Symmetry: D4
Subunit: 140 residues, 8 copies
Amino acid sequence: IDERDKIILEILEKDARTPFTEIAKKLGISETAVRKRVKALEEKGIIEGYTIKINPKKLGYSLVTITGVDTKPEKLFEVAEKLKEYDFVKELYLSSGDHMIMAVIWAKDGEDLAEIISNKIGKIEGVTKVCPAIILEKLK
Amino acid sequence: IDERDKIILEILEKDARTPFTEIAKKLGISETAVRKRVKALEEKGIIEGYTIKINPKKLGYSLVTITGVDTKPEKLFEVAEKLKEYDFVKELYLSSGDHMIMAVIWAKDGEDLAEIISNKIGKIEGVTKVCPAIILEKLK
Amino acid sequence: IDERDKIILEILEKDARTPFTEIAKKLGISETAVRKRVKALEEKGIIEGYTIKINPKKLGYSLVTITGVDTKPEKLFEVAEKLKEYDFVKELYLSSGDHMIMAVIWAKDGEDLAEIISNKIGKIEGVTKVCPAIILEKLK
Amino acid sequence: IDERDKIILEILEKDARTPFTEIAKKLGISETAVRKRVKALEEKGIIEGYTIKINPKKLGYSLVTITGVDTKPEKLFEVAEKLKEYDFVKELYLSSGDHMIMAVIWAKDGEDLAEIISNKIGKIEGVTKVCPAIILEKLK
Amino acid sequence: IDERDKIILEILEKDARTPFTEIAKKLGISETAVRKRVKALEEKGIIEGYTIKINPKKLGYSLVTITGVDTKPEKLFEVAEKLKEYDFVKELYLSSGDHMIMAVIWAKDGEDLAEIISNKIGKIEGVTKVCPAIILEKLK
Amino acid sequence: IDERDKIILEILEKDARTPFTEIAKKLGISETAVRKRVKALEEKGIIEGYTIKINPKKLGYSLVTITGVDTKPEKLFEVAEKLKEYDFVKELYLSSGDHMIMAVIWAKDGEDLAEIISNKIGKIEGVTKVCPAIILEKLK
Amino acid sequence: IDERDKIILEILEKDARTPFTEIAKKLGISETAVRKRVKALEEKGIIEGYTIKINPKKLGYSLVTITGVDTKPEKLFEVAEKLKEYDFVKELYLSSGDHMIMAVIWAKDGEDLAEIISNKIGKIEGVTKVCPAIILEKLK
Amino acid sequence: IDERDKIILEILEKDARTPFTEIAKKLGISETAVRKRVKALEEKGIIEGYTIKINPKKLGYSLVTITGVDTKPEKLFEVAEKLKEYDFVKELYLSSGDHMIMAVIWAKDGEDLAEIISNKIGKIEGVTKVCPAIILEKLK
């Protein structure tokens, strides 16, 4: 996308309430345009949706963990949807890294991680290895 | 946080434009409350900010890559801030996984990945190993 | 063999329809030394065959993957054979590396790669693990 | 493209001097449909070239090795380029796997392999590590 | 807590029968400040218990081993519990490292270590893999 | 040694201030058999010392980490010695595992752990790599 | 052992036919002594036996391979004795390295290795991973 | 080699003092032949030499260790000869396994291993990683 639309996504991704009117003065173009642009990005799908960036330490989620999930080859997708279903898997990927599954989980402590691993993820038919990697700090 | 505030963050994280008024009818409480709550989460920091969820395939970023960055122990933080500075490092972590640095990079193709790796990340004073793991699909 | 063979061999891997006369003037040798040479090369199995260098990129295969395939030790030769049957498996090795079965897979995209692994390789009986390394550029 | 292309492509990788007439009667299509087809294939870069399948075993290369080459991150593109210059490096990749540089090396024997690693690859400046996996059989 | 606690704590891990008076003259504080301090330490669970540092070497245990124990994900908590029952398992962790179960095992010799792995750990149901790292010297 | 020693040893690791009389009635042996036993145990170095089991969790150390420390081979004994000097290093080993130096580190939180690695361990000269595995629960 | 007996084993290990008489003049002692010594080492077991050092390349065993053999923990010893039984396992160890079993196998070629692996070692009830590492050259 | 010569090497490798005369009656052939054969194997090089199989536990060498030695690619052979020179490297190989060097070292204890590693092998110009794997038991 155009340069203008690139700037507009930069800006919105920093504060998605920036009012159109502010974008327009940022770009030298006008509201209607900033409007039009925004909608068009939205209709296209570049803007999937309007969301919120939520802080895990302040919700008490002290161990944001990147968890690997190995699987019997044959049950990759069956595991993946049941990991999809748990509310502590805050985002799920198929990867070409060491483990195909790759969950960004939020546990609140070692015993919560250890609990989740074994009682929730460890018990999914098909799961052959959970490999949790705890995030020391988020930098960007 | 309270259960009500948990629901309110669920909802907002699904569409952070849901109007207060809709939250209120969702919870059986009232606008003012949904208002008050929201602000309070915001002032607290549970709501870091209002943002946008942007689709890499439709921006032409076909290889969303989880890149490991090894470093000389002594230059961890110096590497980390220069990786922080590049606009293709869409999020940066310190981890207890195989590589301390852990960048979620967006390249547009193998040659873009290979370019970025070696010409941009590979040349940061201190970087001793880039380990890129390409995301086959995002599931959540 | 001899130097002119290695050169003839070099030339022929480059352009297999290279005229014998241009081979000839290059080596500074009759077309009929060439011709004779080409055919002992062919005779002895040194040239085992004439084929076409095909570009995956132009054919929709943007993801050339080196997939290691781990397997139940009983079944290494079964899984190889179910793997060679498939058209995505472009070349297939029994190797001493980290995985006994090594395949060069051509998938369209991440999704396609995700799909081949999970639905076609993965369900082969005896496959204990698929390990894809995506190739970024081919340099020779 | 279309099925007859994929088949023509199949046939041509098998025996590149396959008569167009046999291609033709097989697809059940004129020699001149074939001929036209072959040349849009050639035109579009799908057939990028005619070459010879050469057997290392008969040429004294009994050790076909997949050598991963680790390297100082600064110098990944230098080391690739000093590597492609050499004749033992039969094919050379920039890959996402455990090692950025991946080469298919043909050495005569263990000793020869030991020798190429230590004396020719190893001394290339910037090579931090050579990782050879010897191939046992080639199956496709 | 406070510095004198950390020091009292230091002293007490060194010689747990250190007189309170020597603690006392060292910190330059009454025996009865000490005494009070020791017991809020004891009260709050900071001192959780008095025990003996035992030397494996003099007890015939010349092989202090850190044994990672891999396991079927279903059964991580079963295998831990069958492991803690045994006397060779001196300390037992649920860790985020390469293996979820981590034990500090004391075997007499290689043979004994071979034996514990194969006959006692190994047969525990659900153990998919034992990974022993023998400790060479203990330095603190 | 003998069974009553192993039991006395068991009892004493449990509660080191266990009365000799309760040891005694348990083994069914004089206080003065006990007393004698305890002191040959002490004499021979089997009991090498009396210390306190200290709980990191209550002391603010919520992150008990097993940190492998890789190092320039020249400097393995230097780096160990600069490591034992530090108070976060609670126990320190020279081990046969994946890393020669193995330390049990107590950091407050992820950040603190990030900090110790980068600022205190990492800058030790000769440290080529820090490898932290966070412990989730301690079970014995 | 004594210094004299150390020298005598050095010498014998270089040529175990060196006649006693030559040892004696080597040491300044006498035949009878060199005799006595030798016998005593033999009776003790320091000299397990008199054997021959046999060259694998000249027997046509071009791939002397250090093979890892993973196993279900429970069937370690059952695998080990059946690997013991094959005549191509020229020496078998239990190790604390990556794989407990560790065979020094002699195959004659990649296809022999690949054959042995899968048809002989790969089919032992219990074997979960063969990891062959080919010796490029023997240096001592 | 012939079947007869295979048997003769089996036999000799079990006791290389078996007198010719015993081989001959074992094979049904005659002394002179068994003679002739033996010499011919010797002159050929299949019999490199006559040696002794020496027991490390009874010499007090309790940790027979398979040590990996990583190296800067460029200094492979320079390291290898200095490892060749130490009397505790009882046999040295170049490998295609994880580490090119591969020493079978005999230390007498953890502190001897740890000493050797760091003071002797760790200090060889060029050595970038020692990876010792202790043999629990020898089975063949």
